[PDB]
């Protein structure tokens, strides 16, 4: 135990990472513009319904 | 009134010139690595040493769910969808000194412009993750298409304000 | 008595705009592009013919307005009421959700405590690893103390000293100071307390 | 006949979802067993809201997950994986 020097001899500590980096999150965007892209295929065959 | 048949098919060809030379380019990313460390820039496909003794050697890039995700990264093909209905876009509007009064013409263009926003976006987010795998920062590439974008929504905005006036004239 | 002596590990120096840093630079960038197509959909699809041009509302700047309240959760005075509509409000007003509560919580995370662990009183963990190197005065009563002395800890600090390679004493008080502050805080020198204290 | 009710179910529909979202309404239900039923659905979502923004830091943020073998039994069950024993020593044998 006095040559150990990997860190699970003590990592403990668990200090916060910094900040919120994006790939946390891109999950969120994907749906996001799916819902846009979903949007304006439902406005367009609404109306190619209507006008005939 | 009238002119901003100009400032669209200006617009157009901007946003078209501004993302074919962003794919187009080396510079995308500052890092630091090795052209088999030294200060390194990457496009898309390919990287480059700079301030090295290597000054100038180029080589392919490597890329090797966990598995999609490099795909799109390998193919990149949100950026080259974005170019392609930035042309089919500029082609529309140019094609509308012809068939007059169909008024179709005009309406596909914006939904082209627009398409083509949300495939850049797509891109972007897309490219920006796949670094996650230093003090780096982004290239002027990068910025080129970040501009593009926003020319490609202001355009598919003008050609939208430009239908709706030039249908309802017809209602009296 | 014996004392230790380390570089000072700076002090804290916040910026100007600090409240921006529980979330990276490429969020608050990506998220005026997401505001931009949000609302430049939200026009190309409400302005769309009703068969009544005079209709609706949400012409491009009641758009811009409208993305930007719902946002800030904020309210408005106007809600869209075709479904193509409401299911572009729909999607933005769930992004808003996760995104403005992380960054309420992120920033309680730091609000908490900002410390730098540093050796433990007592040097013991002098005794616990390679990573730091330490010396004495040469011919000093501090380097005869930690000779002749059984306490284990002291003992394997002798044995350290008396073992490590290359020399890590020093001449002077002089010496020891200088050597404390150009070995990048990879080595600590022990002294006589009241001398510590005139240095610092 | 009666339609002073502005609900209808595609508007009741969408007035339940924009108060789970905590965004604003333009109606509300304006009748004693109408006040009766939205004003249930608002406590509700705040005792449900505040207790999933309070753990999300330390959730978005695991590090450790997977592992292909953890009792290492399977390893007499699976043949992608090869092993070995030293030679000349008493594992062998025991084997």
Same mark, same amino acid.
């Given at each position: 135990?006095?040559?150990?020097? &990997?860190?699970?001899?003590?990592?403990? $500590?668990?200090?916060? @990472?910094?900040?919120?980096?994006?790939?946390?999150?891109?999950?969120?965007?994907?749906?996001?513009? +799916?819902?846009?892209?979903?949007?304006?295929?439902?406005?367009?065959?609404?109306?190619?319904?209507?006008?005939? | !009134? +009238?002119?901003?048949?100009?400032? @669209? =098919?200006?617009?157009?060809?901007?946003?078209? $010139?501004?993302?074919?030379?962003?794919?187009?380019?080396?510079?995308?990313?500052?890092?630091?690595?090795?052209?088999?460390?030294?200060?390194?820039?990457?496009?898309?496909?390919?990287?480059? &040493?700079?301030?090295?003794?290597?000054?100038?050697?180029?080589?392919?890039?490597?890329?090797? %769910? /966990?598995?999609?995700?490099?795909?799109?990264?390998?193919?990149?093909?949100?950026?080259?969808?974005?170019?392609?209905?930035?042309?089919?876009?500029?082609?529309?509007?140019?094609?509308?000194?012809?068939?007059? @009064?169909?008024?179709?013409?005009?309406?596909?263009?914006?939904?082209?412009?627009?398409?083509?926003?949300?495939?850049?976006?797509?891109?972007?987010?897309?490219?920006?993750?796949?670094?996650?795998?230093?003090?780096?920062?982004?290239?002027?590439? *990068?910025?080129?298409?970040?501009?593009? *974008?926003?020319?490609?929504?202001?355009?598919?905005?003008?050609?939208?304000?430009?239908?709706?006036?030039?249908?309802?004239?017809?209602?009296? | 008595?014996?004392?230790?002596?380390?570089?000072?590990?700076?002090?804290?120096?916040?910026?100007?705009?600090?409240?921006?840093?529980?979330?990276?630079? /490429?969020?608050?960038?990506?998220?005026?592009?997401?505001?931009?197509?949000?609302?430049?959909?939200?026009?190309?699809?409400?302005?769309?013919?009703?068969?009544?041009?005079?209709?609706?509302?949400?012409?491009?700047?009641?758009?811009?307005? *409208? $993305?930007?309240?719902?946002?800030?959760?904020?309210?408005?005075?106007?809600?869209?009421?075709?479904?193509?509509?409401?299911?572009?409000?729909?999607?933005?007003?769930? *992004? @808003?959700?996760?995104?403005?509560?992380?960054?309420?919580?992120?920033? %309680? %995370?730091?609000?908490?405590?900002?410390?730098?662990?540093?050796?433990?009183?007592?040097?013991?963990?002098?005794?616990?690893?390679?990573?730091?190197?330490?010396? =004495?005065?040469?011919?000093?009563?501090?380097?005869?103390?930690?000779?002749?002395?059984?306490?284990?800890?002291?003992?394997?600090?002798? =044995?350290?000293?008396?073992?490590?390679?290359?020399?890590?004493?020093? !001449?002077?008080?002089? /010496?020891?100071?200088? !050597?404390?502050?150009?070995?990048?805080?990879?080595?600590?020198?022990?002294?006589? $307390?009241?001398?510590?204290?005139?240095?610092?």
């Amino acid at each position: 135990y006095d040559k150990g020097e &990997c860190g699970a001899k003590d990592s403990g $500590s668990k200090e916060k @990472t910094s900040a919120l980096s994006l790939s946390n999150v891109a999950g969120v965007f994907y749906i996001l513009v +799916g819902g846009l892209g979903l949007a304006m295929l439902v406005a367009l065959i609404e109306f190619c319904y209507k006008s005939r | !009134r +009238g002119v901003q048949m100009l400032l @669209t =098919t200006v617009g157009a060809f901007a946003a078209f $010139s501004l993302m074919t030379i962003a794919v187009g380019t080396d510079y995308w990313l500052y890092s630091r690595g090795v052209c088999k460390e030294v200060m390194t820039h990457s496009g898309l496909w390919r990287t480059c &040493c700079l301030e090295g003794n290597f000054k100038g050697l180029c080589k392919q890039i490597d890329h090797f %769910a /966990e598995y999609f995700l490099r795909a799109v990264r390998a193919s990149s093909i949100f950026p080259i969808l974005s170019v392609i209905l930035l042309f089919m876009g500029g082609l529309c509007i140019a094609a509308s000194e012809f068939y007059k @009064t169909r008024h179709n013409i005009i309406l596909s263009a914006g939904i082209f412009f627009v398409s083509a926003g949300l495939s850049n976006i797509i891109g972007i987010i897309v490219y920006i993750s796949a670094n996650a795998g230093n003090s780096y920062s982004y290239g002027w590439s *990068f910025y080129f298409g970040a501009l593009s *974008f926003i020319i490609a929504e202001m355009v598919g905005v003008l050609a939208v304000h430009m239908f709706i006036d030039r249908h309802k004239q017809l209602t009296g | 008595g014996i004392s230790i002596m380390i570089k000072k590990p700076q002090k804290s120096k916040p910026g100007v705009f600090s409240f921006l840093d529980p979330l990276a630079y /490429e969020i608050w960038m990506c998220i005026v592009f997401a505001y931009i197509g949000v609302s430049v959909v939200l026009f190309l699809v409400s302005r769309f013919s009703p068969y009544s041009e005079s209709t609706n509302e949400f012409g491009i700047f009641n758009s811009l307005w *409208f $993305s930007l309240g719902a946002f800030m959760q904020q309210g408005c005075d106007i809600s869209p009421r075709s479904l193509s509509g409401r299911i572009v409000g729909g999607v933005w007003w769930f *992004f @808003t959700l996760i995104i403005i509560s992380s960054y309420t919580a992120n920033l %309680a %995370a730091f609000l908490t405590v900002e410390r730098m662990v540093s050796p433990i009183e007592s040097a013991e963990d002098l005794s616990k690893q390679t990573e730091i190197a330490y010396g =004495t005065l040469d011919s000093g009563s501090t380097k005869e103390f930690f000779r002749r002395s059984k306490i284990a800890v002291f003992d394997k600090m002798w =044995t350290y000293m008396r073992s490590a390679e290359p020399s890590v004493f020093v !001449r002077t008080t002089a /010496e020891g100071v200088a !050597r404390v502050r150009k070995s990048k805080g990879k080595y600590a020198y022990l002294l006589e $307390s009241t001398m510590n204290e005139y240095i610092e």
